[model samples]
Target chain A: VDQADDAAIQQTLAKMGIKSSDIQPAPVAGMKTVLTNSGVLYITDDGKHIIQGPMYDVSGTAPVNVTNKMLLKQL
Target chain B: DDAAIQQTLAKMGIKSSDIQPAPVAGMKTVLTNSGVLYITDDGKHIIQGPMYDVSGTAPVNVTNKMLLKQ
Candidate 1:
């Protein structure tokens, strides 16, 4: 497991507003953390948190929120 | 709602013309396992499907779930 020193962790906290105590050290394979909020989040993890918004699928020409479509059962 | 449906279909690479109203039910609708969706009159309240995100947390499958019942 990789551990961040106090200074590095402090810097990260300053940038993200996450408390050191709240930092739940979770280790995953392959993926890296993209955005930091209440928790350290990976891009590919499904339902990582209580996300109550829209996520768009833009791998192709048309940028569509697959999550919204899936939730609505538009398929 | 028709406009919304048309816009949604256009984004999904499906032609709006291909969507026909259900004849037996009338009112130009398409019958699916979910339910009937109106093709015209701006698709006011006829969307019933699921929406999901491709990469992140967001509103996904908002319509399809509507068809399967609560």
Candidate 2:
């Protein structure tokens, strides 16, 4: 992982009201997750695109809130 | 009103039996497919998101660990 890229991404997100400490690597490859005050956001590894919605893991017996799981780890 | 509450939960793919009194007063918590949620005792209001206890120096996810046990 490139520390410069991570720092750049964190800087960009900070402008949008997302804290650097609130971001983490997502379960999905090449993607990152952010726990914002409003909700969860998924960003591309390159810090280009961002998805402002929930992502679910449907392979289990019940749908798992992957976003919540990521957010939980930050707490 | 009870039936309405049940119906509403059912529509959201939740079972009434899965709901129990939460640590917070007048609020009930349910383990759903999406995640843990809190609802009013009357079941008229639902909080479908995470919450933090900021009373202490560090914030704590109120329902995160609780859901892990389930």
Candidate 3:
């Protein structure tokens, strides 16, 4: 985890009243996940393009948001 | 107004049945994943923090009591 990258993401989300500490390494490669007070968000490694809600994996045998399931465990 | 409130609740993944008129006028109580929340009838605003009944000798957390029912 890059200290600078974490600080940058935290600074940006702070304006939205979301703490960056909520962010964690996602199940998917090169992606990060954030659990907000309301729901979940998935972001790319670069911290751009926030995807809200669950994401499905169609490439797998059973389609499911693998990251979402992982988040549930954390909750 | 109903449509607007419904839409707002839908975005929060809450059902109409989960909401009821709050003790205060113009406010509605909603059961949410995070806990009980107070929303204006117009659905334009939401109060995420605890609500208190301060009229008594000691402040009582009205919203927290509601959450206990769940």
Fnat, one value per model = 0.00, 0.00, 0.00
lDDT (tens digit, per residue) of candidate 3 on A1-75: 566656655654564456635677754554466677646655445553344445443333344555567677887
Q: What is the full ranking by TM-score, best candidate first?
A: 2, 3, 1
Candidate 1 deviant stretches above 4 angstroms: A1-54, A57-61, A64-75, B15-65
Compared with the true structure, all predictions reach lDDT values of 0.34, 0.57, 0.57
User: Which residue pairs come into collision in candidate 3?
Assistant: none
lDDT of each residue in A1-75, candidate 1, tens digit only? 134333443443354344443222222222123334443322222322112223333334565543345434422
A1-75 per-residue lDDT for model 2 (tens digits): 468657655765655455745667655555566667757765555564454546554333455677667666676
TM-score of each model, paired residue for residue: 0.21, 0.44, 0.43
What TM-score does each prediction get for chain A alone? 0.28, 0.71, 0.69
Where does candidate 2 stray beyond 4 Å? A15-20, B1-70
Which candidate number would show the highest TM-score if scored against the true structure?
2
Output the lDDT of residue A58, model 3.
Answer: 34
Question: Which pairs in model 2 have colliding backbones?
Answer: none
Estimate, for each residue in B9-42, the C-alpha lDDT of model 2 and write its tens digit.
7655665346655544445566766667655455
Give the residue spans of candidate 3 off by over 4 A: A27-30, B1-70
Ranking by lDDT: 2, 3, 1
